[PDB]
Structure 1
Amino acid sequence: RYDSRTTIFSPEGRLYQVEYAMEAIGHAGTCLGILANDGVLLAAERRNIHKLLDEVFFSEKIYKLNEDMACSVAGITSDANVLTNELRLIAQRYLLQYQEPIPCEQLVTALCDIKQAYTQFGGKRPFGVSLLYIGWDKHYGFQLYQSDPSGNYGGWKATCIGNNSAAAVSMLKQDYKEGEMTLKSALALAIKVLNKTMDVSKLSAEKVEIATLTRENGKTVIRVLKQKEVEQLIKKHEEEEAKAEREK
């Protein structure tokens, strides 16, 4: 009725491509991050777990963007390549300008202004990509951020991806943690969330993806960890399911 282009307003006034970009988020890979001090982690779901791929890339959703920041991603894939190139270029231009790493919030607002430049103008497709942010600074420590196709960014401590992850956010609230900064506790919580939310029976470790970010002595290393610790984490969580069925 008032469909035609991204511009102009609807008669209430709401937006068309904004709601539909959100509904383009909802059918994508599920991500989350956790509340942790002395480190921060990411979780990700493998789309297309078919047997004839290569996995030689070591990272399909994580993008180690500067040195001490990576980002997960969700949405239309090749727009995210367009976004990651530009994001790396923005942070690297900042480092060129000051010789100090980017303190991550003006990085987030730069990308939000990039996305908003296609929200206002006409006629261009808005970026249908929401994506996460982990990172470290001199001013707040470990951080977590949620980009949105509107240009809004919300600093969370426990985040939200689309229709697959509302029950995940419900579990994050009903299983809210505070004070426990131990990475292994957060990993067990993430294992519990992805066990419930993903429909992978018994949570095959090839269908998941976990990357962490710790502060080591002055380096802020990013640990895109290997598969054996994921296997024993799954075994840990299934032993804790045996503890949960000690109630029978």
Structure 2
Amino acid sequence: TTTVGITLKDAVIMATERRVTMENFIMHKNGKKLFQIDTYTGMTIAGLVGDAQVLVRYMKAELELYRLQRRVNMPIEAVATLLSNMLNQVKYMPYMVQLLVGGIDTAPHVFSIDAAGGSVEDIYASTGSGSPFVYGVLESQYSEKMTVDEGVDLVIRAISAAKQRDSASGGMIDVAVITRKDGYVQLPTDQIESRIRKLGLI
């Protein structure tokens, strides 16, 4: 698994691959690891599939109820805090997951949350077995001044590098762009493929 989230001037970009290992072989080449959980909030999952899917359902319900009861979206930091409390409360019987939460309330934000409820904000982050390869790409090429279009190309290149070296990763790359003006926009695969050819990644 390889997931990544980066922050730009007024946008958040999140991306994953799609390979789901089960029964110690490549059973599903087209899984889903990136989810929209609020109007301007997204989430990526790594680890046990069953635990992660349950958490996604819980977060969608809680955020929706919050927005109805309080007339505003839950702030991104509060989303991370709520997740941190739930995970820590069962730390000795834990959800074995690693999560990324990203979105926009008044500024872009990306949060990394571990199985024990530790939550840390960062300018960019990556999870899964392919993450170390991603950090190498991000360390040498990431820039805060990048445009949205440059950022999308960057995450695509980072995940492509991970797929070449981490056997647990593979499949088509999914990308989401979150802005206040346009909201949560899932990039259609046709542009993802077009960028892949343009970047020379075959």
TM-score range, shorter chain: 0.7 to 0.9
Counterpart in the other structure of 2:177: 212
1:185 alignment partner, SS class: helix
Q: Decide which of 76, 81, 98 is 2:48's aligned counterpart.
A: 76
> Given the alignment of the two structures, is residue 43 of structure 1 paired with residue 8 of structure 2, yes or no?
no
Which structure has the larger Rg? 1
> Given the alignment of the two structures, is residue 117 of structure 1 paired with residue 82 of structure 2, yes or no?
no
Q: Cα deviations across residues 145-172 of structure 1 (Å, max 9, x unaligned)?
A: 1111121111111102143211321221
Q: Cα deviations across residues 185-223 of structure 1 (Å, max 9, x unaligned)?
A: 1122122212222128xxxx952211211222xxx5211
Gaps of 5+ in 2: none
Counterpart in the other structure of 1:134: 102
Alpha-carbon RMSD across the aligned residues, in angstroms, is 2.7
TM-score normalised to structure 2 length: 0.85
The 2-side partners of 1:48 and 1:147 are apart by 21
User: Mean alpha-carbon deviation: is it higher for 147-156 or for 163-172?
Assistant: 163-172
Q: 1:84 to 1:163 in 2, by over 3 A?
A: closer
What is the 5 A alignment of 1:3-14? none
1:92 Cα deviation from its structure 2 partner: 2.3
The 2-side partners of 1:52 and 1:151 are apart by 30
TM-score normalised to structure 1 length: 0.70
The 2-side partners of 1:48 and 1:75 are apart by 10
Q: Cα deviations across residues 12-59 of structure 1 (Å, max 9, x unaligned)?
A: xxxxxxxxxxxxxxxxx100112312322111011149999796xxx8
What is the 5 A alignment of 1:1-248? 29-48=1-20, 60-119=32-91, 124=93, 126-138=94-106, 141-180=107-146, 182-199=147-164, 207-216=172-181, 220-238=182-200
The 1-side partners of 2:40 and 2:155 are apart by 22
Runs of 4+ in 1 over 2 A off after TM superposition: 48-55
Structure with the larger RCO, 1 or 2 (CA within 8 Å, 6+ apart): 2
Query: How many residues matched?
Result: 195
Amino acid at match of 1:215: R
Query: Quick one: percent identity of the two aligned structures?
Result: 24
The 1-side partners of 2:29 and 2:140 are apart by 38
The 2-side partners of 1:149 and 1:189 are apart by 28
Q: 1:48 to 1:87 in 2, by over 3 A?
A: closer
Q: 1:54 to 1:156 in 2, by over 3 A?
A: closer
The 1-side partners of 2:199 and 2:67 are apart by 42
